[PDB]
Every structure is written in C-alpha cells, then in structure tokens.
Amino acid sequence: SLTHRKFGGSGGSPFSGSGLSSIAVRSGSYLDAIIIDGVHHGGSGGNLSPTFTFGSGEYISNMTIRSGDYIDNISFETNMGRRFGPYGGSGGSANTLSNVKVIQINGSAGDYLDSLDIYYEQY
C-alpha cells in the first residue's frame, strides 16, 4: 500500500535513486544535490556532507523537507533513531513525512535539486 509524494518545484530533469544504502547532500542555502549511493542529483555548488550509510534493516522513518522552487533543507530520522541533517537553508515551506518506511527516493534536478518524489509506506 505504497504512496509517492512530491516536494519541491517544477524544474529539472527526472531521476530515480539507485538504492537507499547511503545518502549525502551538497548544500548551502539550497540543496544543490542529493547524493544517493554515491551518485549526485543536482549541481556542483555547495559543501559535501559526510555520507550516512544505512545499517541492515535500517530505513527512513521520519523526514522533514523545506522546499520552494528547489529543495531547501533535508533532515531525517531512521527506524533505529539515527539522524541526518538538517542540511540546507531556512526558505520555502516545511513538510514532514512521519511514521513512514521510505523505500525509494526519486526527484528532478538541474543546477539544484528541484524536487523529490518519495515512495513510502505509511503507519
């Protein structure tokens, strides 16, 4: 009983994330890129965060995304209580996925990370 939900603007070219084994971001005041299993989606500006590597049986359970035209900020927490972020700036509007199991992260990107389309189960 999966759902997909989009965050962010209408720009960029679509991508599918290659798995959810690791995540990093390149960020400044925007999310310049999300890095999924070492592959970036977005541009080259901003600073490279350390990589969050998921443990066995670990998945994103809560996520807060700030966005406007672009993804502005990402933070998440896993089912095991580990946290990533926040990374990015304070613009846009905040939306949260709570008590979920994220299965796949897709989106659209150009010079920035325009949008995310998150596939998840809802509890």
Curated annotation (Swiss-Prot):
Gene3D superfamilies: Jacalin-like lectin domain. InterPro entries: Jacalin-like_lectin_dom, Jacalin-like_lectin_dom_sf. Keywords: Lectin, Mannose-binding. Belongs to the jacalin lectin family. This is Griffithsin. Residues 1-122 form the Jacalin-type lectin domain. The keyword DNA-binding does not apply. Mixed specificity lectin with anti-HIV activity. Binds to HIV envelope glycoproteins, including exterior membrane glycoprotein gp120, and inhibits viral entry into cells. Binding to gp120 is dependent on gp120 being glycosylated, and is inhibited by mannose, glucose and N-acetylglucosamine. The lineage of its organism: Eukaryota, Rhodophyta, Florideophyceae, Rhodymeniophycidae, Ceramiales. It comes from Griffithsia sp. (strain Q66D336) (Red alga). GO terms for molecular function: carbohydrate binding; D-glucose binding; D-mannose binding; identical protein binding; N-acetylgalactosamine binding. The keyword Cell cycle does not apply.
